[PDB]
Design a protein around this ligand. Structure first.
Ligand SMILES: NC(=O)C1=CN([C@@H]2O[C@H](COP(=O)(O)OP(=O)(O)OC[C@H]3O[C@@H](n4cnc5c(N)ncnc54)[C@H](OP(=O)(O)O)[C@@H]3O)[C@@H](O)[C@H]2O)C=CC1
Ligand code: SF4
Ligand SMILES: [Zn+2]
Lengths: 95, 347, 108, 162, 180, 180, 28
């Protein structure tokens, strides 16, 4: 449903996370479980997963004309990550 | 403040450095009349910013001594033998130059050179020689404010005719038209002081009614730099008058005040009398060499130019277009030179 | 042409087809020869002088080169191999530029 | 690494006996009296690496080295050529001061100096040098080991051939 | 861009002298930003001079991804500028001003886009996500066809591979020596 | 490679490098006793792209750099530690400069990436940094590309971008473009 | 007026001691 609509809404999606951290455990679960499904729904959409040891987990969406919205995903379960991405899609609809 | 480039083609390549003496500016200049009062300051401004100035001068090593200090090694080039009638020398002088400034002028006539030669023939000949080259990008000619074709004085009339000839040959030339320039080596305040102090009586043409707009030498020198830093100025005549318009009587009175002269030594030598006293003495001048005793003041041309108002026309370009605020010539640093003479606590 | 040519060595003290060690002096002015960079005239260059001097025959497979005749008034003592040297292809003293050749290696 | 056992002994001892009073960062720079735009320049605190031409370890941070090896260097600025003589001209007052004279034993010393004057600094640690030979040529004996071509096959022996 | 190819009307070359000729529609307005004059500069309506790796303090990522930085060994030549400053000045001119106005701010933007760029000199490990990616691109990998080409290097001549090497006289001599 | 074998102390660093590391196995000590000599017995040219490293490995200047020949002395050069953009290895290098000119490039120690070795392209491509350089902004006219100021070039780029819209604007990055 | 540096105005072929060759744009 809404997973199909990321391409239409987002120009790119960035998932920043820490390689080994307690705060980024939920982000790691999200990326190692739902990234394949999100890519399957949106093949041509660039979903960039970038990681560093001291990196702070976040979910950033770039809309048309360079408008970027960053959502912190720290200490949030994988389901909450999915909800936050849905909220990002709704915000993109508002634009 | 941000340094503005000299708007010359391919300057961006050659220019390098902070803009000081040792920096490289992409301006090679042939300033005719460099050893003069106006020319020396223009040479100083151009050379101060790291540019190279070629200074053609009539053989006189002591007169061109200050120009030696003006620039770093190899920047101020002094060419020894300058003649206004020699084409080949003029071509050699402007060979490497991309800007040419003409400050060559005579206040009075002599036997060797008349007004028509210096103020008309030389500008036309130099204009043709500059036009044939093509490397020269900017041309600046310095003239009086009161110069007009319909002027009684021969000097101010010949100057305007020469300016028109320059405009004909080079359409993109800029005609700088400053007023009576005040400076340490000026011929305005210095001659007025010498008149007040070492002359039996100070003759004033009419009652000093004639209005003038004197300007400080540094302002004109900066105005030259602002002309060269903008290409949009090309083809336009700028009347660089001073901040304040003053009658000649006010300037005489204020000189008497600053010097603290005992009383007023000025007399009323009204017009129609100077036109009879100096009229033969002009013919005397044209047949005799340069003599210090009589000059400039003691001529019919000076009386004719002191019966008119040498003020800027209302619609005209000036210092405001160049974003310069002229300094007052009756107060401040401009007047220090006359101040050193006497201020009433002095001697 | 010289603007796109590879700097090369004639080969008197070097080989015919080697690169020439070059700095960037004169690159803006447009000079690409060693002598042009420092001499602006049309006179005879010191390289022209050294070329005019002819190779000298010596006996043995090594020659001691002091540059000048007196050892302490010239270049440091140098020992140059004369093996595989002939008049057309002489050995060279690096300090002085003198050329030497010997026939001893050919068992003569 | 043992000890210099020379004037450096008294040098270090003068260091440990005495100390400097703490001041707020940048306050000394005003006392210095130099133009304040000097401290707008950025600082790199680094130790030079070894030149590839030479095999000496003196210039490196090595236990052999007993000299200050950490430099404060300023960023490179514009340089041009003299129009008359082609000399290299500059307007940078701090061109050679840091390389020539600002030498420190330890990175914290240079950082303290920079913070005291108010210079912003970035410290770059040298790439670690470990003197570990590879397993193939760990020793001189390894040069002539059976590793080169394997143990000699004895199928060429006349008894084995026949 | 991939879904609906659009003939480019303005092409910006950021040091690209190795572009395929079909990349520019031959009626496009080409802006070349770079430090050597080569195939890119010849086909440019506007050429913007930029500094080289020896003249700028810039970030590069290795094949292992370790972020390393250059220093300004020699000053910039003529009226050339640092490339990011050129792009930001152009952004102000065109009416879309970019937030950064200093090199550390640019580095902070790089840290935001990719956190490892903050860790200069250190290689950051990568989570093994390659299998999930190929599970994601199932239809596309099926879409990809077979080509009559054999796996081989694209480097014809090693000494000349970029604009700097092509300008080098020494590399040309090395290439001539190999080709004789 | 320039040769002065008279200066050669008979270490075996060049032979050991050519055999173990470079692997072309071209150099050896031919002879016995004092007349023992180092080099190819035949007239051969060193073929490895790691050939420059023997010059650094040579302790006594018998092997020297022909491009960097008689041009400068060591004390005259200011060294700045930077990285090589020749390839994606990011070899750590030290660029030695006199004034505004880069005089030579030599490797630095980084066991992580380049142990202490540098490829010939990276070592000797500084020559092409003095040639075919772009110094000033150029804007095309009927007379070709011509000198322009930064403002005029930006104005032309603005007039060009105004026409294009969306994917009509296209960017191609080069081999040597940096992250910023 | 016999000896002057090569960068002098008097020198027949005046020298700008630039150490970099500049790209010349193609004609037309
Ligand atoms: N009050 C002022 O100063 C004002 C001046 N001007 C104009 O600016 C110009 C110069 O101003 P100023 O410098 O005061 O005048 P100067 O006489 O002080 O400078 C004149 C220059 O021209 C040279 N010169 C004069 N005649 C000849 C000639 N026949 N052949 C060669 N060179 C010659 C002089 O050299 P030498 O010394 O060898 O004669 C001198 O260098 C004049 O045209 C003047 O009208 C404009 C506004 C006001
Ligand atoms: S490395 Fe140098 S000194 Fe050693 S054998 Fe080779 S050429 Fe001779
Ligand atoms: Zn000798």
């Amino acid at each position: 449903a809404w997973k199909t609509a990321l391409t239409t809404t987002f120009q790119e999606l960035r998932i920043t996370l820490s390689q080994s951290s307690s705060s980024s455990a939920g982000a790691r679960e999200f990326v190692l479980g739902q990234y394949a499904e999100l890519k399957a729904a949106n093949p041509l959409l660039p979903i960039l997963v970038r990681e560093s040891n001291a990196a702070q987990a976040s979910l950033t969406a770039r809309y048309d004309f360079g408008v970027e919205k960053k959502v912190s995903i720290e200490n949030d379960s994988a389901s909450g990550i999915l909800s936050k991405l849905e909220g990002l899609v709704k915000h993109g609809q508002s634009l | 403040s941000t340094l503005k480039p000299f708007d010359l083609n391919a300057n961006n390549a050659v220019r390098n450095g902070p803009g000081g003496r040792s920096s490289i500016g992409g301006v090679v200049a042939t300033v005719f009349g460099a050893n003069g009062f106006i020319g020396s300051y223009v040479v100083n401004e151009i050379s101060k910013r790291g540019n190279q100035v070629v200074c053609p001068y009539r053989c006189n090593e002591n007169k061109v001594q200050p120009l030696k200090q003006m620039g770093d090694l190899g920047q101020v080039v002094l060419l020894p033998e300058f003649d206004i009638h020699d084409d080949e020398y003029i071509r050699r002088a402007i060979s490497r130059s991309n800007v040419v400034i003409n400050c060559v002028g005579i206040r009075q006539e002599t036997k060797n050179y008349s007004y028509k030669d210096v103020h008309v023939d030389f500008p036309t000949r130099l204009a043709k020689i500059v036009a044939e080259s093509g490397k020269v990008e900017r041309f600046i000619q310095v003239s009086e404010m009161g110069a007009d074709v319909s002027h009684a004085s021969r000097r101010l009339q010949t100057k305007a005719v020469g300016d028109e000839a320059i405009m004909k040959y080079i359409p993109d030339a800029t005609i700088i038209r400053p007023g009576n320039v005040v400076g340490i080596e000026d011929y305005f305040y210095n001659n007025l002081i010498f008149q007040l102090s070492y002359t039996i009586v100070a003759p004033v043409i009419n009652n000093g009614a004639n209005k003038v707009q004197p300007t400080y030498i540094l302002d004109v020198a900066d105005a030259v730099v602002k002309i060269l830093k903008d290409k949009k100025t090309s083809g336009k005549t700028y009347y660089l008058g001073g901040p304040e318009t003053l009658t000649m009587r006010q300037i005489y009175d204020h000189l008497i005040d600053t010097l603290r002269l005992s009383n007023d030594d000025t007399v009323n030598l009204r017009y129609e009398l100077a036109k009879m006293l100096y009229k033969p003495l002009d013919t005397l001048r044209t047949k005799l060499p340069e003599f210090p005793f009589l000059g400039f003041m003691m001529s019919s041309d000076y009386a004719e130019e002191q019966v008119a108002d040498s003020v800027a026309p209302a619609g005209s370009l000036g210092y405001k277009d160049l974003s310069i605020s002229p300094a007052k010539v009756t107060e401040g640093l401009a007047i220090e030179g006359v101040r050193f003479i006497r201020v009433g606590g002095y001697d | 042409a010289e603007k796109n040519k590879i700097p090369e060595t004639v080969g008197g003290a070097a080989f015919k087809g080697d690169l020439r060690g070059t700095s960037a002096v004169g690159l803006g002015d447009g000079l690409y020869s060693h002598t042009s960079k420092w001499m602006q005239g049309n006179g005879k260059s010191p390289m022209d002088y050294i070329n005019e001097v002819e190779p000298i025959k010596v006996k043995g497979l090594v020659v001691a080169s002091h540059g000048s005749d007196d050892p302490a008034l010239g270049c440091p003592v140098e020992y140059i191999s004369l093996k595989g040297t002939s008049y057309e292809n002489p050995a060279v003293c690096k300090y002085t530029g003198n050329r030497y050749y010997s026939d001893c290696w050919k068992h003569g | 690494a043992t000890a210099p056992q020379d004037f450096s002994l008294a040098m270090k001892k003068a260091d440990e006996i005495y100390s400097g009073k703490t001041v707020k960062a940048g306050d000394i720079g005003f006392s210095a009296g130099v133009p304040l735009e000097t401290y707008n320049r950025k600082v790199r605190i680094f130790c030079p690496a070894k030149a590839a031409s030479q095999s000496g370890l003196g210039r490196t941070l090595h236990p052999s080295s007993k000299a200050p090896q950490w430099k404060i260097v300023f960023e490179n600025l514009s340089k041009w050529e003299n129009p008359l003589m082609g000399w290299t001209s500059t307007a940078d007052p701090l061109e050679n001061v840091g390389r020539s004279t600002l030498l420190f034993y330890t990175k914290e010393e240079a950082a303290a100096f920079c913070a005291k004057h108010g210079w912003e600094y970035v410290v770059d640690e040298p790439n670690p040098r470990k003197h570990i030979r590879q397993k193939r040529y760990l020793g001189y004996g390894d040069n002539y080991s059976i590793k080169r071509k394997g143990v000699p096959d004895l199928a060429h022996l006349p008894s084995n051939r026949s | 861009a991939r879904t609906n190819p659009v003939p480019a009307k303005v092409v910006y070359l950021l040091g690209s002298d190795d572009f395929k000729d079909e990349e520019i529609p031959a009626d496009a307005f080409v802006i070349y930003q770079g430090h050597h004059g080569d195939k890119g500069a010849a086909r440019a309506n506007v050429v913007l001079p930029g500094a080289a790796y020896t003249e700028k303090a810039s970030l590069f990522a290795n094949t292992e991804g370790r972020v390393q930085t250059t220093r300004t060994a020699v000053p910039v030549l003529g009226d050339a500028r640092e490339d990011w400053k050129i792009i930001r000045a152009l952004s102000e001119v065109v009416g879309q001003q970019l937030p950064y106005d200093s090199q550390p701010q640019v580095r902070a933007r790089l840290a935001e886009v990719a956190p490892h760029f903050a860790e200069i000199g250190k290689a950051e490990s990568a989570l093994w996500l390659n299998g999930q990616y190929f599970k994601g691109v199932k239809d596309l990998v099926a879409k990809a066809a077979r080509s009559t080409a054999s796996l081989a290097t694209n480097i014809s001549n090693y000494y000349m591979t970029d604009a700097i090497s092509r300008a080098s006289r020494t590399m040309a001599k090395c290439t001539a020596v190999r080709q004789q | 490679i320039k040769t002065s074998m008279n200066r050669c102390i008979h270490c075996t660093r060049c032979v050991r490098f050519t055999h173990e590391v470079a692997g072309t196995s071209e150099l050896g000590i031919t002879g016995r006793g004092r007349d023992s000599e180092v080099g190819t017995y035949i007239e051969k040219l060193h073929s490895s792209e790691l050939s420059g490293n023997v010059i650094d490995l040579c302790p006594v200047g018998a092997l020297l750099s022909k491009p960097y020949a008689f041009t400068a002395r060591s004390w005259e050069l200011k060294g700045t530690e930077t990285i090589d953009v020749s390839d994606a290895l990011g070899s750590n290098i030290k660029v030695d400069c006199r004034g505004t000119e880069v005089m030579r490039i030599t490797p630095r120690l980084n066991d992580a990436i380049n142990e202490e070795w540098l490829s010939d392209k990276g070592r000797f491509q500084y020559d092409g940094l003095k040639r075919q350089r772009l110094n000033t902004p150029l804007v095309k006219g009927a007379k070709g590309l011509e000198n322009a100021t930064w403002s005029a070039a930006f104005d032309a780029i603005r007039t060009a971008i105004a026409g294009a819209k969306g994917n009509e604007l296209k960017a191609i990055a080069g081999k040597l473009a940096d992250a910023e | 007026e016999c000896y002057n540096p090569k960068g002098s105005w008097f020198n027949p072929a005046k020298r700008n001691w630039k150490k970099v060759e500049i790209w010349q744009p193609p004609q037309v």
